[PDB]
């Protein structure tokens, strides 16, 4: 079934110490999150750059890692029920807060953790290049060659287009209908590895370290080993849902060239351009497209997705 998605976002100093902490602390956070039976996996990204759209963002390029002073992370966690995410945070708060807070020395902005419903998904299971022979054998044995997926390699060996959209109030249905039509046509592009549309349902105060006054002071005053009061979050997840409605159009690609020209198909192929124009007419903001590297992941979220 379709899981819910929590995306923890932060910006940190682009230096070796940061990536060393990703390597030691990141796995610990994921192991704690996996204590909850509603957890069905994760996909953690670093932003490597920005799609320049010609020279609309002429100061950007798809890989800015060599020059950037910061690194943005976008950590997707997947949940049977979005309420499972909220319960997990509170049930394991002592570990989670102390782990997450240890990243403070590297932090410039965040954490900020919106929650999403998936309204469309065409996403395959991940496979390594070593797996495809067995995958093909099995699908033919089952008499379902149509279910043989493209090879979507895990652990940093593909790239993601993270396309931000916000929609004019009242035009949500037009956006959703048109973007689904767009993505159903987009899958013809070479190197297309899947797409999904995420629709914001709210924001996790606790995941964003956004408490009332009491918790705020506890965060600011923390030596690193004392939990803020987890009951001091002052808003529920839906209370923080944004209007204009926010969406993420998440599209995966074999490589950054396939991404650039593939995403570009909605501009370069007249038939698809006409369909995608219906998306563009609904927007308050976007499309703004971040280029992401899915480095650390629990690929079994796609097994749950596709059952």
Judge whether 276 and 267 are in contact, CB under 8 Å. yes
Question: Which is closer to a second copy, CB of 118 or CB of 275?
Answer: 275
Q: Interface with a second copy includes 36 (CB under 8 A)?
A: yes
Stretch that binds a second copy, among 1-9, 115-123, 266-274 (CB under 8 A): 266-274
Give the contacts of 208 (CB within 8 A, at least 6 positions apart). Answer: 110, 111, 112, 113
Count, residues in the chain: 307
Stretch that binds a second copy, among 1-9, 115-123, 201-209 (CB under 8 A): 201-209
165 is in an annotated binding site: no
Binding residues among 129-148 for a second copy as defined by CB under 8 A: 129-141, 145-148
230-253 in b/e form (b: 16+ CB < 10 A) is bebbeeebeebbeeebbbbbbbbb
| Min dist. Cβ of residue 22 to a second copy (A) | 11
Phi-psi region of 41 (alpha: psi -120 to 50; beta: other; left: phi over 0): left
- x/- site string to a second copy, residues 153 to 192, per CB under 8 A? xxxx-x---------xx------------------xxxxx
- Contact partner, 87, from Fe ion, a second copy, none, Cβ < 5-8 Å per class: none
CA distance 262 to 281: 21
Q: Interface with a second copy includes 150 (CB under 8 A)?
A: yes
- Contact partner, 184, from Fe ion, a second copy, none, Cβ < 5-8 Å per class: none
Residue closest to Fe ion, measured at CB: 207
| Min dist. Cβ of residue 262 to a second copy (A) | 9
Residue 43 to residues 66, 126, 133, 295, Cα–Cα distance (Å): 23, 11, 25, 8
CA distance 90 to 72: 25
85 is in an annotated binding site: yes
Q: Which of 90, 105, 173, 184 binds a second copy (CB under 8 A)?
A: 105
Stretch that binds a second copy, among 1-9, 51-59, 115-123 (CB under 8 A): 51-59
89 is in an annotated binding site: yes
What are the structure tokens assigned to 183, written together? Answer: 């993505």
Number of residues located near a second copy, criterion CB under 8 A: 134
Judge whether 286 and 63 are in contact, CB under 8 Å. no
């Amino acid at each position: 079934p379709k899981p819910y998605v929590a995306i923890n976002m932060a910006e940190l100093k682009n230096e070796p110490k940061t990536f060393e902490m990703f390597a030691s602390v990141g796995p610990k956070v994921c192991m704690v999150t996996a204590r909850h039976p509603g957890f069905v996996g994760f996909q953690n990204h670093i932003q490597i750059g920005i799609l320049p759209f010609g020279n609309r963002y002429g100061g950007a390029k798809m890989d800015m890692t060599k020059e950037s002073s910061t690194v943005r992370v976008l950590q997707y966690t997947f949940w049977k029920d979005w309420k499972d995410h909220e319960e997990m945070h509170r049930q394991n708060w002592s570990y989670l807060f102390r782990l997450c807070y240890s990243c403070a020395s590297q932090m410039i902005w965040g954490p900020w953790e919106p929650i999403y419903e998936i309204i469309y998904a065409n996403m395959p299971i991940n496979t390594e290049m070593t797996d495809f022979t067995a995958v093909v054998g099995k699908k033919f044995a089952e008499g379902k060659p149509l279910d043989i997926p493209v090879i979507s390699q895990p652990y940093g060996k593909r790239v993601v287009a993270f396309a931000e959209h916000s929609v004019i109030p009242g035009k949500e249905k037009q956006f959703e209908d048109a973007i689904v039509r767009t993505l159903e046509m987009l899958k013809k592009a070479p190197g297309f590895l899947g797409a999904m549309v995420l629709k914001e349902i709210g924001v996790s105060g606790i995941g964003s370290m956004q408490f009332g006054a009491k918790g705020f002071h506890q965060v600011l005053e923390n030596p690193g080993s004392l939990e803020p009061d987890p009951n001091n979050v002052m808003y529920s997840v839906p209370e923080a849902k944004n209007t204009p409605q926010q969406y993420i159009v998440h599209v995966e690609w074999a490589n950054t060239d396939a991404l650039m020209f593939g995403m570009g198909r909605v501009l370069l192929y007249p038939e698809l351009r006409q369909v995608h124009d219906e998306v563009l007419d609904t927007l308050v903001y976007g499309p703004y497209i971040r280029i992401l590297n899915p480095m650390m992941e629990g690929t079994f979220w796609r097994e749950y997705l596709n059952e």
